[PDB]
UniProtKB/Swiss-Prot annotation:
Function: GTP hydrolase that promotes the GTP-dependent binding of aminoacyl-tRNA to the A-site of ribosomes during protein biosynthesis.
UniProt lineage: Bacteria, Thermotogati, Deinococcota, Deinococci, Thermales
Keywords recorded for this protein, A-Z: Cytoplasm, Elongation factor, GTP-binding, Hydrolase, Magnesium, Metal-binding, Nucleotide-binding, Phosphoprotein, Protein biosynthesis
Region (G3): 80-83
Protein name (Swiss-Prot/TrEMBL): Elongation factor Tu-A
InterPro entries, alphabetized: EF-Tu_GTP-bd, EF-Tu_GTPase, EFTu-like_2, EFTU_2, G_TR_CS, P-loop_NTPase, Small_GTP-bd, T_Tr_GTP-bd_dom
Originating species: Thermus thermophilus
Catalysed reaction, written as an equation: GTP + H2O = GDP + phosphate + H(+)
Annotated region described as G4, given as residue ranges: 135-138
PANTHER family noted in UniProt: ELONGATION FACTOR TU, MITOCHONDRIAL (PTHR43721:SF22), ELONGATION FACTOR TU-RELATED (PTHR43721)
One Pfam family recorded for the sequence: GTP_EFTU
Subcellular location field: Cytoplasm
Gene name of the encoded protein: tufA
Length: 404
């Protein structure tokens, strides 16, 4: 829709939470509610978000979706994540883009295993703040149950070092708000009970999730979240720009996952299908890459200023191994354990090598060991990561030292 005009600060948010708790319905409601007060917002219905044939077939979100909305204060890109246990990988890549997450929890069900898992994982890809939306209150008459659900959620957040007692917990119905906006798309704040709860959420997002300190002077770095072919344009890599700036005509390097880095020229930069003169740190963009196909760039690589990043394969890490009560392993593991490691949008198999004398690591252990990744990836000291294996989260770590 033409050129992107920067009128206000930009923040990346998104929806996480257990399967079916109402993330996508809420995402759609946010677009409709905000669109009444700001005509730059294009509304997105439920089927515009869960749009893929496989999402229709399976009846769940599978792919992250990005939607745009804005308030008087700020412009938002919103990443809606799947809740299903089998699509955690996609959720991780989504959370890796968020400056703050909206944790959706059904009032009728309370916190559930992916409520816990998403909180834990959001932390490990750097989500700094969480707002809670307690959804489906239209289904729950009993005030006592609502208070219990809120108490449990606040306590759950405390377990993962979020300020659980301080987070806003907004109670409402994404569906009833969305219904009201369908019957009157011009419904303004103060007119409807359910719509006003969405405004309470928007207010909490505005005021509780700060605009991050970003650095546009450091070398360009954009973790790639997705890649696709646009008919008649070419290959687009999407992602949140971590730092620096990118302009059409810039040479960039595609770093990680391949034996060697390759260079390409950026031939387009857009945010929400609007042309950007310059992509800057924080922007949620699509970057058109010349001379590469969608088989030559992939999720988990990073786009970088040429020569600015050396990818790595081997590192030391401080790792907490989840207890089974946290959805972790029942039993311990040995050197040669071979799980998946998640750094930002990157997912890669790695080999655990314990010190001489450390035979075994048990659930509950805080331990240090060495990991050798099977492919090079953009890494740095202090970077947090998650460890998963066999479809479950088994560990949380931070890179302490880069060895190679
Ligand atoms: N009664 C009621 N039902 C709701 C509400 N919000 C969502 N639902 C229902 O809950 C179901 C799941 O909604 P959905 O938005 O797809 O949830 P999700 O969290 O995005 N699912 P997933 O984890 O697969 O992405 C749908 O049947 C939807 O109609 C609400 O406020 N009230
Ligand atoms: O359709 C897209 O998402 C797109 C096209 C060109 C760019 Br850059 O992003
Ligand atoms: Mg969904
Ligand atoms: N989706």
């Amino acid at each position: 829709k033409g050129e992107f005009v920067r009128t206000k600060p930009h923040v990346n948010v998104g929806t996480i939470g257990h399967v079916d708790h109402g993330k996508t319905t809420l995402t759609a409601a946010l677009t409709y509610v905000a669109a009444a007060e700001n005509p730059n917002v294009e509304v997105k219905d439920y089927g515009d978000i869960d749009k893929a044939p496989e999402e229709r077939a399976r009846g769940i979100t599978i792919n992250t979706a990005h939607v745009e909305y804005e308030t008087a204060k700020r412009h938002y890109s919103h990443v809606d994540c799947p809740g299903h246990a089998d699509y955690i990988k996609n959720m991780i890549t989504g959370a890796a883009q968020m400056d703050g997450a909206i944790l959706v929890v059904s009032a009728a069900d309370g916190p559930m295993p992916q409520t816990r898992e998403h909180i834990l994982l959001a932390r490990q890809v750097g989500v700094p703040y969480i707002v809670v939306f307690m959804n489906k209150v239209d289904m729950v008459d009993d005030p006592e149950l609502l208070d219990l659900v809120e108490m449990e959620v606040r306590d759950l957040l405390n377990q993962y070092e979020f300020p659980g007692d301080e987070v806003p917990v907004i109670r409402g119905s994404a569906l009833l708000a969305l219904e009201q906006m369908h019957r009157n798309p011009k419904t303004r704040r103060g007119e409807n009970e359910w719509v006003d709860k969405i405004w309470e959420l928007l207010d909490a997002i505005d005021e509780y999730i700060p605009t991050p300190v970003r650095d546009v002077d450091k070398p360009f770095l954009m973790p790639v979240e997705d890649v696709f072919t646009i008919t008649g344009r070419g290959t687009v890599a999407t992602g949140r720009i971590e730092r620096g700036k990118v302009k059409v005509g810039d040479e960039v390097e595609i770093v990680g996952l391949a034996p060697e880095t390759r260079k390409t020229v950026v031939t387009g930069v857009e945010m929400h299908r609007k042309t950007l003169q310059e992509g800057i740190a924080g922007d949620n963009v699509g970057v058109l890459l010349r001379g590469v196909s969608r088989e030559e760039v992939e999720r988990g690589q990073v786009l970088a200023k040429p020569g600015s990043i050396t990818p790595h394969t081997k590192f030391e890490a401080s790792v907490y191994v989840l207890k089974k009560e946290e959805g972790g392993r029942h039993t311990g593991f040995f050197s040669g354990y071979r799980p998946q490691f998640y750094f930002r949008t990157t997912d890669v198999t790695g080999v655990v090598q314990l010190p001489p004398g450390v035979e075994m690591v048990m659930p509950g252990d805080n331990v240090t060991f060495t990991v050798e990744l099977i492919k090079p990836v953009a890494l740095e000291e202090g970077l947090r990561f998650a460890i998963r294996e066999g479809g479950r989260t088994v560990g949380a770590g931070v890179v302490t030292k880069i060895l190679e």
